[PDB]
């Protein structure tokens, strides 16, 4: 009796469980590196640190490409900007220029710590008004980090109540929603198989994103001055200026649409990533009062109430620094990073990988590898401290919250500063507790282009100790 012709085979059910976890689980059958073919496209998935470091660092430039996706084309205005731009002159220029911009913010009025703290100060005054109430803290945090990224990009901020903030939240949620159903990694290309309105809806939100950023950049052409380079748009316009002095080869690279998309990548990631990690952290603290208590003891013992926290306090608030590390481990913002692509014929783990092959680093697998981590599925900030609680250790080499190599995160410094000061200022002022109905946040998460957490509410109360210290 005969066996059936097989025209197709997938290792696991699509749209069942988080992709990143399905790939991980599948290593128990197939090892830390395996591929899948979808028509002509081949994708390689890699779930061990050594192989990952090879893809990101040792052979970084071989695999520094980005695959093309119909969805990422719309958000990137056809692979302009930085994150979804393929390897090439454009990407290199803008990545470098965006990196150069952050370097500015080391000193003076536009020192990064002082910018963040001004916005955190507002946030906390605002949250304090909700004393005794249970709220979703998303929008307040969104506002705070949006003003920061706006300052970095434009040296402008939004006034309290500016309806533009709401317009931005709307299109951000709309784009993230339609950019991918779940993660960026789709085994089956569902959107090209059945009738649907995904690209239409995505274009609509991006169009509002673009029109908005266009007015800002239009208006700023009147304000640009070559003797005043203090933000990212300055930096970018200076480059276009210097290029056109017949025009340089960088001239094509810096059209207004190029500048716009890069600003968009930076504006989008400056809000969505950090707002998200803040929510995750609070979520984990609601689930672990014992950790949360010790963060209060720590921040009262090393900072007290004479003054507000400072970047300098990273020295003493070690458990807080450890807590942040652990969230970035347990719930990485990008658990499969952003997809990479083989720029040339190369190899991983001595296996052949052809030009154009998509390569995906399963960061989730690295952070949950049993042989590299003690009880990986547990929230344990202590793992990032020595047993004495006196300083910060790196307990595993299988840890890359911010990527590495040519495509590593360019916003890490900003991220780490925002994350640490937001959590420090909040913990100094507020008791952050479970709402009156007793609902805890689901820690499962919602994987999109970023690893989001479901909306949830936190009962916020002004601390006794903070109050008593106002005299």
Ligand X SMILES: C[C@]12CC[C@@H](O)C[C@@H]1CC[C@@H]1[C@@H]2CC[C@]2(C)C(c3cccnc3)=CC[C@@H]12
Interaction of residue 409 with ligand X, rule CB under 6 A:
yes
> Site for ligand X (CB under 6 A): which residue of 69, 112, 269, 322?
269
User: Number of helices and strands (H, E) in the chain?
Assistant: 16, 11
Residue 137: alpha-carbon gap to chain centroid:
18
Check residue 143 for interaction with ligand X (CB under 6 A): no
Handedness of CA 283, 452, 311, 316 (dihedral sign): positive
Tell me which H or E stretch contains 433: strand 430-433
Decide: is 264 part of the binding site for ligand X (CB under 6 A).
yes
Provide the β-strand partners of residue 385: 392
Which residue number, 269 or 458, has a Cβ lying nearer to ligand X? Answer: 269
Three-state DSSP class for residue 343: coil
Strands 41-46 and 451-452: unpaired
Is residue 451 within 8 A of residue 331, CB to CB? The reply is yes
List residues bridging with 360 in a β-sheet.
45
Q: What are phi and psi of 357, to 5 degrees?
A: -75, 135
Choosing from 45, 123, 165, 176, the residue that interacts with ligand X (CB under 6 A) is 176
Q: Measured between alpha carbons, how far is 175 from 209 in angstroms, rounded to an integer?
A: 9
In the complex with ligand X, the residue whose CB is nearer, 179 or 453, is 179
Q: Which residue of 175, 278, 342, 427 would you call a contact of ligand X, by CB under 6 A?
A: 175
Closer Cβ to ligand HEM, 69 or 266, answer by number: 266
Q: Is 208 in the site for ligand HEM (CB under 6 A)?
A: no
Q: Does 328 bind ligand X (CB under 6 A)?
A: no
- 425-464 residues near ligand X, rule: CB under 6 A: 449-450
Work out whether 75 is an interface residue with ligand X (CB under 6 A): yes
Range in contact with ligand HEM (rule: CB under 6 A) among 71-79, 175-183, 209-217, 404-412: 404-412
| Residue 409 binding ligand HEM, by CB under 6 A | yes
> In this chain, which of 274, 346, 362, 396 binds ligand HEM, going by CB under 6 A?
274
**Window contacting ligand X (CB under 6 A); options: 100-108, 212-220, 267-275, 376-384:** 267-275
* Among 287, 321, 271, residue whose Cα is nearest residue 450: 271
> Cβ of 191: how many Cβ atoms within 10 Å?
19
CB of 403 to ligand X, least distance (A): 8
Which position has the token pair 């070559």?
A: 226
User: In this structure, how many other beta carbons lie within 10 angstroms of the beta carbon of residue 236?
Assistant: 27
Residues making up the annotated binding site for substrate are 172
The smaller minimum CB distance to ligand HEM, of residues 42 and 408, is found at 408
Q: Measured from the CB of residue 409, what is the shortest distance to ligand HEM in angstroms?
A: 3
Phi, psi of 90 (to 5 degrees): -50, -55
Residue list, annotated binding site: 172, 409
**Widest distance between CA atoms in the chain:** 89
Is residue 276 part of the contact set for ligand X (CB under 6 A)? no
Partner interacting with residue 46 (select from ligand HEM, ligand X, none; CB below 5-8 Å by kind): none
277 binds, among ligand HEM, ligand X, none (CB under 5 to 8 A by kind): ligand HEM
Picking from 448, 455, 457, 444, the residue whose alpha carbon sits closest to that of residue 174 is 448
Is position 83 an interface residue for ligand X (rule: CB under 6 A)? yes
* Residue closer to ligand HEM, measured from CB, 82 or 233: 82
Stretch that binds ligand HEM, among 379-387, 401-409, 425-433, 463-471 (CB under 6 A): 401-409
- The closest alpha carbon to 235, from 78, 110, 416, belongs to 110
- 219 to 110, 154, 214: CA distances (angstroms): 22, 11, 8
Question: Which C-beta is closer to ligand HEM: that of 264 or that of 376?
Answer: 264
330: Cβ contacts below 8 Å, ≥ 6 apart: 284, 367, 379
Going by C-beta distance under 8 Å and a sequence separation of 6 or more, which residues neighbour residue 338?
A: 66, 83, 84, 184, 407
By CB under 6 A, tell whether 104 contacts ligand HEM: no
- Residue range at the interface with ligand HEM (CB under 6 A); choices 34-42, 229-237, 251-259, 398-406: 398-406
Q: Give which of ligand HEM, ligand X, none residue 274 binds (C-beta under 5 to 8 Å, depending on kind).
A: ligand HEM
DSSP class per residue in 113-128? HHHHHHHHHHHHHHHH
410 binds, among ligand HEM, ligand X, none (CB under 5 to 8 A by kind): ligand HEM
41-46 and 358-361 beta bridge pairing: parallel
- Does position 235 bind ligand X by CB under 6 A? no
If contact means CB under 5 to 8 A according to the sort of partner, which of ligand X, ligand HEM, none does residue 264 touch? Answer: ligand X
Given the rule CB under 6 A, which residues bind ligand HEM? 82-83, 95, 265-266, 269-270, 273-274, 277, 328, 333-334, 337-338, 401-403, 407-411, 414-415
Given the rule CB under 6 A, which residues bind ligand X? 75, 83, 172, 175-176, 179, 264-265, 268-269, 272-273, 333-334, 409, 449-450
């Amino acid at each position: 009796l005969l066996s059936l012709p097989l025209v197709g085979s997938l290792p696991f059910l699509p749209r069942h469980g988080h992709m990143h976890n399905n790939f991980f689980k599948l290593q128990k059958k197939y090892g830390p590196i395996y591929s899948v073919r979808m028509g002509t496209k081949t994708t390689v998935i890699v779930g061990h640190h050594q192989l990952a470091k090879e893809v990101l660092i040792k052979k970084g430039k071989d695999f520094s490409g980005r695959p093309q996706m119909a969805t990422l084309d719309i958000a990137s205005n056809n692979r302009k900007g930085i994150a979804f731009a393929d390897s090439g002159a454009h990407w290199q220029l803008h990545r470098r220029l965006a990196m150069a911009t952050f370097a500015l913010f080391k000193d003076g009025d536009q020192k990064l710590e002082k910018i963040i703290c001004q916005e955190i100060s507002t946030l906390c005054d605002m949250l304090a008004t909700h004393n005794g109430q249970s709220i979703d803290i998303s929008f307040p945090v969104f506002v705070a980090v949006t003003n920061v990224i706006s300052l970095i990009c434009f040296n402008t901020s939004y006034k309290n109540g500016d309806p533009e903030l709401n317009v931005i939240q709307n299109y951000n949620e709309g784009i993230i929603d339609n950019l991918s159903k779940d993660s960026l990694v789709d085994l089956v290309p569902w959107l090209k198989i059945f009738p649907n309105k995904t690209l239409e809806k995505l274009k609509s939100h991006v169009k509002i994103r673009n029109d908005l950023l266009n007015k800002i950049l239009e208006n700023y052409k009147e304000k640009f001055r070559s003797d005043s380079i203090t933000n990212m748009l300055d930096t970018l316009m200076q480059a276009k200026m210097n290029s056109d002095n017949g025009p340089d080869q960088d001239s094509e690279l810096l059209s207004d649409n190029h500048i716009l998309t890069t600003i968009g990548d930076i504006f989008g990631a400056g809000v969505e990533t950090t707002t998200s990690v803040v929510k995750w952290t609070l979520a984990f603290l609601l689930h672990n009062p014992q950790v949360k208590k010790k963060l209060y003891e720590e921040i009262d013992q090393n900072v007290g109430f004479s003054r507000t926290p400072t970047i300098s306090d990273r020295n003493r608030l070690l458990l807080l620094e450890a807590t942040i590390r652990e969230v970035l481990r347990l719930r990485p913002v990008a658990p499969m990073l952003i997809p990479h692509k083989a720029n040339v014929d190369s190899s991983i783990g001595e296996f052949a990988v052809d030009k154009g092959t998509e390569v995906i680093i399963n960061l989730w697998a690295l952070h949950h590898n049993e042989k590299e981590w003690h009880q990986p599925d547990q929230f344990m900030p202590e793992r990032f401290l020595n047993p004495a609680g006196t300083q910060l250790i790196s307990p595993s080499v299988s840890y890359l919250p911010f990527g590495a190599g040519p495509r590593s995160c360019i916003g890490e410094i900003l991220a780490r500063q925002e994350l640490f000061l937001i959590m420090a200022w909040l913990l100094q002022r507020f008791d952050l507790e479970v709402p009156d109905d007793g609902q805890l946040p689901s820690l499962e998460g919602i994987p999109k282009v970023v690893f989001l957490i479901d909306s949830f509410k936190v009962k916020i109360k002004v601390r006794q100790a903070w109050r008593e210290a106002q005299a």
